[PDB]
Amino acid sequence: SGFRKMAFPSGKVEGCMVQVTCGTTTLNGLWLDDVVYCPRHVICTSEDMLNPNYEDLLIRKSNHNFLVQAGNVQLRVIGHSMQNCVLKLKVDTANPKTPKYKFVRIQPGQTFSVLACYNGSPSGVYQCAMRPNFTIKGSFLNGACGSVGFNIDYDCVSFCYMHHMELPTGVHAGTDLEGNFYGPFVDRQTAQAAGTDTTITVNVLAWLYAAVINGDRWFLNRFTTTLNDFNLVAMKYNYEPLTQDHVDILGPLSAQTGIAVLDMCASLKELLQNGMNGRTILGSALLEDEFTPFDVVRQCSGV
Amino acid sequence: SGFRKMAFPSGKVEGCMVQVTCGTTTLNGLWLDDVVYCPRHVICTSEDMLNPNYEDLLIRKSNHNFLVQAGNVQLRVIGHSMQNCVLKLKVDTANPKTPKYKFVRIQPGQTFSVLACYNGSPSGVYQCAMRPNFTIKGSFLNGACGSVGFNIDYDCVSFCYMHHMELPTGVHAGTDLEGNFYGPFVDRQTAQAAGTDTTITVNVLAWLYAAVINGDRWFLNRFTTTLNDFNLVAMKYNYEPLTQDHVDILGPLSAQTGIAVLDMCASLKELLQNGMNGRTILGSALLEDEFTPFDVVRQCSGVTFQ
Numbered sequence: 001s002g003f004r005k006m007a008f009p010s011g012k013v014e015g016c017m018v019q020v021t022c023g024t025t026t027l028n029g030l031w032l033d034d035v036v037y038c039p040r041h042v043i044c045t046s047e048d049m050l051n052p053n054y055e056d057l058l059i060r061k062s063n064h065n066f067l068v069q070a071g072n073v074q075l076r077v078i079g080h081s082m083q084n085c086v087l088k089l090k091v092d093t094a095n096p097k098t099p100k101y102k103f104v105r106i107q108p109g110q111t112f113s114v115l116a117c118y119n120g121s122p123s124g125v126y127q128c129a130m131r132p133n134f135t136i137k138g139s140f141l142n143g144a145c146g147s148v149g150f151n152i153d154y155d156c157v158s159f160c161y162m163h164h165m166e167l168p169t170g171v172h173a174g175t176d177l178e179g180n181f182y183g184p185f186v187d188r189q190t191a192q193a194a195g196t197d198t199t200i201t202v203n204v205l206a207w208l209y210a211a212v213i214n215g216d217r218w219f220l221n222r223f224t225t226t227l228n229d230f231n232l233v234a235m236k237y238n239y240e241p242l243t244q245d246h247v248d249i250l251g252p253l254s255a256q257t258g259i260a261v262l263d264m265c266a267s268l269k270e271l272l273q274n275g276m277n278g279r280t281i282l283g284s285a286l287l288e289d290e291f292t293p294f295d296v297v298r299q300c301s302g303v
Numbered sequence: 304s305g306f307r308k309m310a311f312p313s314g315k316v317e318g319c320m321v322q323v324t325c326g327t328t329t330l331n332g333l334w335l336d337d338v339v340y341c342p343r344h345v346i347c348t349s350e351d352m353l354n355p356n357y358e359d360l361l362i363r364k365s366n367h368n369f370l371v372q373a374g375n376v377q378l379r380v381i382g383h384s385m386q387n388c389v390l391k392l393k394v395d396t397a398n399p400k401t402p403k404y405k406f407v408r409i410q411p412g413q414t415f416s417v418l419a420c421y422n423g424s425p426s427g428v429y430q431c432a433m434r435p436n437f438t439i440k441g442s443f444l445n446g447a448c449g450s451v452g453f454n455i456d457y458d459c460v461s462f463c464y465m466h467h468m469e470l471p472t473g474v475h476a477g478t479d480l481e482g483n484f485y486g487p488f489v490d491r492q493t494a495q496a497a498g499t500d501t502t503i504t505v506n507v508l509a510w511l512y513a514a515v516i517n518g519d520r521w522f523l524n525r526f527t528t529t530l531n532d533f534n535l536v537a538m539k540y541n542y543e544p545l546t547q548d549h550v551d552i553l554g555p556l557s558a559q560t561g562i563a564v565l566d567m568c569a570s571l572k573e574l575l576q577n578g579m580n581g582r583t584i585l586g587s588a589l590l591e592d593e594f595t596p597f598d599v600v601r602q603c604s605g606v607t608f609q
């Protein structure tokens with residue numbers, strides 16, 4: 001037992017990280033088979049970030065303008081291609097450490113591990129969620145661009161995030177590995193702001209189910225709720241609406257604990273009303289929303 | 304910016320993890336050079352666990368009595384030895400993925416990464432602190448024994464923890480890699496409990512510095528204090544004593560923020576007496592004590608591993 005924010009083991013991603021340099025700009029790239037993926041803004045100067053014309057900047061670059069270093073080794077760039085906001089650098093070597101991998105675009109509420117890297121070297125690994133406002137609450141300094149987010153369900157690495165920017169509230173925005181941004185953000189230094197963030201309701205419920213599996217029952221009550229009355233109350237606390245899909249997804253945890261999904265919703269309604277009155281749940285004094293139903297089952301019941 | 308509970312990258316350690324079977328028992332081992340390290344209780348069965356004679360149990364064992372699997376590959380065991388609560392299985396093959404490493408024993412308050420493993424396969428990585436009561440707040444299911452804790456410095460893995468047991472309250476106990484227990488625990492099925500835990504003061508102050516570096520400043524105040532004054536309030540609230548060495552270690556963060564440890568101790572003094580008054584610090588409603596001063600510097604300066 002016990003319950004922690006757990007990341008995936010990072011080794012399969014560590015062997016894919018490289019440094020990419022173009023002019024004065026250095027950041028991280030991801031080397032899978034014979035392609036290095038990195039943010040297209042590696043081709044920009046620090047002035048000329050307001051309104052970059054990336055098509056115009058890229059046509060002016062030679063293969064030999066990209067310095068790609070994997071440890072001491074310099075890789076040879078033999079071709080370049082832009083896909084949305086990602087640059088794909090063709091190199092003469094397939095990475096021999098390339099894992100079994102897929103690219104996946106995730107939905108808000110989904111969790112993933114981040115391997116924070118500087119100069120193509122790993123600094124640390126932590127767990128994140130795609131917020132409902134399509135930001136992530138990351139930990140990134142100058143040099144972190146091209147750091148990736150991933151899951152490893154079985155031996156297959158699903159890459160879902162590539163880091164590009166920090167927004168004014170100290171939260172982060174980036175793309176899938178096809179270079180499409182999460183949310184309405186652009187790779188320009190123009191004024192942009194995250195929408196109002198909301199709590200990931202289905203994840204809070206999953207985490208209350210974790211608490212019951214780990215033997216804590218103090219917050220339960222004798223009440224039930226309709227799905228609609230739950231949403232009318234939860235939205236007053238800036239909680240995301242709970243859908244019938246979310247109710248279906250919570251079915252297994254419901255069956256394991258013997259607590260109906262709408263009985264657990266009544267518990268959450270009372271927690272939002274009362275707070276915790278000096279108590280904690282799984283070591284937290286706040287309601288946790290960065291564990292998915294699938295994360296709870298994986299950590300509580302066998303991996 | 305941002306601040307997250309961050310683990311070390313686990314790749315150097317993932318290459319050392321193997322499965323060890325002795326009869327009915329499967330758990331994890333650590334394969335370094337030509338030796339596999341695992342918990343000595345791998346030799347025990349049901350009857351043995353209630354009062355084990357580890358000397359007497361280890362005599363009756365073949366080398367072929369220990370199945371060691373690295374992926375599909377069976378390693379050949381050519382020797383076995385016990386060191387305190389660890390078994391050392393000599394194999395005929397040096398691990399070609401052996402990193403630069405040493406074995407270190409950490410102090411209460413120090414943090415490390417755990418690579419939670421099952422059947423020799425890494426499943427997850429998270430950051431822990433050795434609690435003042437010598438437990439860790441881990442997350443471990445059946446099969447986790449022999450999972451290890453570590454720190455990295457440049458390209459050197461310091462192994463500090465090997466997992467042995469769960470206590471009541473769902474906290475965890477284990478050994479250093481020389482098989483010495485952290486805390487007053489024994490590797491037998493018997494009545495054991497975690498002692499009263501205390502809050503790691505120097506780590507809470509480190510995390511208040513992380514808060515300030517990230518623009519979370521509401522708890523700062525005009526007041527200062529001294530050790531004796533703060534420490535009399537610390538003991539009061541089941542906080543570890545703050546030593547002069549702690550004050551020195553936080554030195555850098557006092558400089559970088561303009562808040563002297565004792566000025567920050569004045570902020571922490573106030574938070575304990577008064578509470579947080581509806582507010583959060585770095586997204587927590589409680590005072591975080593599992594970041595060391597070094598962790599805060601590591602994270603807020605972008606230190607990388609080679």
Ligand SMILES: *[C@](O)(C(=O)NCc1ccccc1)[C@H](C[C@@H]1CCNC1=O)NC(=O)[C@H](CC1CC1)n1cccc(NC(=O)OC(C)(C)C)c1=O
Nearest residue numbers: 041140141142143144145164165166167168187188189304
């Ligand atoms: C990314 O480009 C990066 O890491 N680049 C390498 C590098 C940058 C700076 C110095 C040396 C090397 C960064 C990552 C950022 C930096 C701080 N934390 C991060 O997550 N991304 C950008 O700088 C990004 C590039 C834009 C998308 C194309 N960018 C540019 C300009 C402004 C901002 N944000 C900003 O001003 O943030 C506030 C909070 C408003 C100060 C930005 O992210």
Ligand SMILES: *[C@](O)(C(=O)NCc1ccccc1)[C@H](C[C@@H]1CCNC1=O)NC(=O)[C@H](CC1CC1)n1cccc(NC(=O)OC(C)(C)C)c1=O
Nearest residue numbers: 001344443444445446447448467468469470471490491492
């Ligand atoms: C460890 O031995 C292990 O993982 N063994 C492999 C295994 C395979 C299949 C089934 C069980 C075990 C475990 C690790 C435990 C299991 C669950 N969480 C853990 O951290 N350690 C023990 O089982 C340990 C071995 C003893 C020290 C030599 N042990 C034995 C008996 C009792 C407990 N604890 C206990 O009863 O915990 C409470 C909280 C009281 C239920 C114990 O840890």
